[PDB]
Amino acid sequence: HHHHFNLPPGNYKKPKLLYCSNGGHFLRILPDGTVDGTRDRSDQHIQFQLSAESVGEVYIKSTETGQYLAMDTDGLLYGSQTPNEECLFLERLEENHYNTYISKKHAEKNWFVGLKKNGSCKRGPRTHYGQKAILWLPLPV
């Protein structure tokens, strides 16, 4: 392992919203596969169903479009129609409170799922431990 194994409490029984502490945005995957953040709580594309592959490994799937959150070879997030190796994330506790999601594929590079204060996605290499951009709070739908 290249990372710790402090896991967050909670389960995957129900869908959730993923709120980024940084700019207070909800993660969003639009129909065309575009990923970004929005403050609009009434958005129909901010609801996600998380599921565990192995302990601590998860898929993040849009309940509205069925698209899986994924990070490509150059670190950009995108919505995938089918589950693949780029869709697996290491879900961990951070700052004893928040949830972080590390690309499994690029875990050695410490590429995280994260949003900038303006709600745009951070590219893998631009993320790192210590940033507010990578801190998530899972909320009930």
UniProtKB/Swiss-Prot annotation:
Cellular component per GO, a single term: extracellular matrix
UniProt GO MF annotations: fibroblast growth factor receptor binding; growth factor activity; heparin binding; integrin binding; S100 protein binding
Functional note: Plays an important role in the regulation of cell survival, cell division, angiogenesis, cell differentiation and cell migration. Functions as a potent mitogen in vitro. Acts as a ligand for FGFR1 and integrins. Binds to FGFR1 in the presence of heparin leading to FGFR1 dimerization and activation via sequential autophosphorylation on tyrosine residues which act as docking sites for interacting proteins, leading to the activation of several signaling cascades. Binds to integrin ITGAV:ITGB3.
Result for mutant: N99A: No effect on integrin-binding. No effect on integrin- and heparin-binding, loss of FGFR1-binding, defective in inducing FGF1 signaling, cell proliferation and cell migration
Compartments, record wording: Secreted; Cytoplasm; Cytoplasm, Cell cortex; Cytoplasm, Cytosol
GO-annotated biological processes: activation of protein kinase B activity; anatomical structure morphogenesis; angiogenesis; branch elongation involved in ureteric bud branching; cellular response to heat; epithelial cell proliferation; fibroblast growth factor receptor signaling pathway; lung development
InterPro entries assigned to the protein according to its UniProt record, in alphabetical order: Fibroblast_GF_fam, IL1/FGF
Keywords of the record: Acetylation, Angiogenesis, Cytoplasm, Developmental protein, Differentiation, Growth factor, Heparin-binding, Mitogen, Nucleus, Phosphoprotein, Secreted
Lineage: Eukaryota, Metazoa, Chordata, Craniata, Vertebrata
Domain of life: Eukaryota
Mod. after translation: In the nucleus, phosphorylated by PKC/PRKCD.
Residues reported in the UniProt entry to bind heparin: N22
Effect of K122A: Loss of LRRC59-binding
Assembly and oligomerization: Monomer. Homodimer. Interacts with FGFR1, FGFR2, FGFR3 and FGFR4. Affinity between fibroblast growth factors (FGFs) and their receptors is increased by heparan sulfate glycosaminoglycans that function as coreceptors. Found in a complex with FGFBP1, FGF1 and FGF2. Interacts with FGFBP1. Part of a Cu(2+)-dependent multiprotein aggregate containing FGF1, S100A13 and SYT1. Interacts with SYT1. Interacts with S100A13. Interacts with LRRC59. Interacts with CSNKA, CSNKB and FIBP. While binding with LRRC59, CSNKA and FIBP seem mutually exclusive, CSNKB and FIBP may cooperatively interact with FGF1.
Outcome of mutating K116E: Reduced integrin-binding. Defective in integrin-, heparin- and FGFR1-binding, and defective in inducing FGF1 signaling, cell proliferation and cell migration
Cited SUPFAM superfamilies: Cytokine
Region (Heparin-binding): 116-132
Motif (Nuclear localization signal): 13-16
Descriptive protein name: Fibroblast growth factor 1
